[PDB]
Amino acid sequence: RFVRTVLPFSQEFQRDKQPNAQPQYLHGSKALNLAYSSIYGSYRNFVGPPHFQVICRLLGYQGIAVVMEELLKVVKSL
């Protein structure tokens, strides 16, 4: 399993701003949204086999190929 570092050495990610929308466009309602957020809140602080399998399913083969190529480039640069 992967767990975050005790002191971060990188915070320049500067992610985008979360877009707000009605509950219907979300899981469906405030209660449903809260329930799903609570359900999925256990995976926030770690990365494991579930995340890897979801990534594989979502990236098929093209995503894995391109990600590994970029990782090889990064390793070569470093």
Partner: peptide
């Protein structure tokens, strides 16, 4: 470049549907 384009190239009346969509979106934030 894609994220920069998406940020800058954002979105840009006498249609009832548009007016209603405005009221409900305003009742939200």
């Amino acid at each position: 470049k894609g994220i920069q384009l998406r940020k800058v190239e954002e979105q840009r009346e006498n249609d009832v549907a548009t007016i209603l969509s405005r009221r409900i979106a305003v009742e939200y934030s």
